[PDB]
């Protein structure tokens, strides 16, 4: 049971080139009943009409609201770094029920991110996890926040299980080359700080928090 992604309007869902290729791979055809999401919490049961090289369109039969906006958000600051790390962190954020991703370039990174690429990673992950309401993605200029913030310092574990998790939480995943001293002063003074393989620490940290917050 595959879940496609498109834009609903005027009784149809329209699909971009990327989706049409994915449908040709599953070898669908005109007449087939399919399920799409718009990424804002809705599910559409549709009959495929057109499948062409760079586009497709299906007629909507049924809509179900599958997920509503949460009252308390889980936010993660993802460092703009080597693509393999960045793609991983974004995928895990979809997976672990994060509501908002914020991309920050820490002082020791010279990387950039394409926000359109990040949205594709979110889309493809969500289609796999059957997540109807996609996390939002934004740039973040400054390490300035409100509410409860937890910082994952990758170069040191601190006590995660002692941390207070009351209310809305932002988790700040640290950069590969480490916080500069300016960043560290800024984050010690404003957040709560908490050695394993990068991929394991990130899953365990964000995943424990999501668990406790019942985001998963």
Distance, in Å, from the CA atom of 12 to the CA atom of 206, rounded to the nearest integer, reads: 37
Q: SS3 helix, strand, coil % of the chain, rounded to 5?
A: 30, 30, 45
Verify binding: residue 14, a copy of itself, rule CB under 8 A: no
Q: Does 95 bind a copy of itself (CB under 8 A)?
A: yes
Q: Does residue 82 interact with Cl ion by CB under 5 A?
A: yes
CA distance 161 to 167: 16
Q: Select 170 or 205, whichever has its Cβ closest to a copy of itself.
A: 205
Neighbours of 105 (CB within 10 A): 17
Of these, 22, 24, 119, 213, which contacts Cl ion (CB under 5 A)? 119
Cα 118 to Cα 91: distance, rounded to the nearest angstrom: 9
Interface map 192-211 toward a copy of itself (x if CB under 8 A): ----xx--x--xx--xx--x
With binding defined as CB under 8 A, does residue 19 bind a copy of itself? no
Member of 109, 148, 157, 168 binding Cl ion (CB under 5 A)? 109
Closest CA to 41 of 135, 115, 144: 135
Residues near a copy of itself, by CB under 8 A: 92, 95-96, 129, 157-158, 160-161, 196-197, 200, 203-204, 207-208, 211-212, 216
């Amino acid at each position: 049971p595959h879940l496609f992604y498109g834009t609903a309007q005027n009784g149809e869902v329209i699909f971009d080139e990327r989706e049409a290729h994915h449908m040709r791979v599953v070898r669908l055809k005109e007449g087939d009943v399919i399920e799409a999401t718009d990424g804002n919490g809705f599910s559409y049961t549709c009959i495929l009409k057109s499948l062409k090289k760079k586009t497709a369109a299906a007629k909507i039969v049924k809509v179900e609201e599958k997920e509503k906006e949460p009252t308390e958000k889980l936010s993660v600051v993802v460092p703009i770094g080597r693509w393999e790390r960045t793609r991983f962190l974004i995928e895990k954020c979809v997976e672990l029920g994060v509501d908002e991703i914020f991309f920050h370039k820490f002082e020791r990174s010279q990387h950039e991110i394409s926000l359109d690429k990040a949205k594709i990673v979110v889309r493809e992950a969500a289609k796999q996890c059957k997540r109807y309401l996609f996390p939002k993605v934004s740039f973040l200029e400054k390490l300035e926040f409100s509410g409860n913030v937890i910082t994952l310092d990758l170069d040191a574990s601190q006590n995660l299980l002692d941390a207070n998790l009351e209310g809305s939480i932002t988790v700040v995943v640290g950069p590969e080359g480490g916080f500069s001293e300016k960043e560290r002063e800024l984050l010690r003074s404003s957040t709560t700080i908490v050695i394993l393989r990068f991929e394991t620490a990130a899953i365990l940290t964000v995943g424990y928090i999501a668990l406790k917050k019942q985001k998963i």
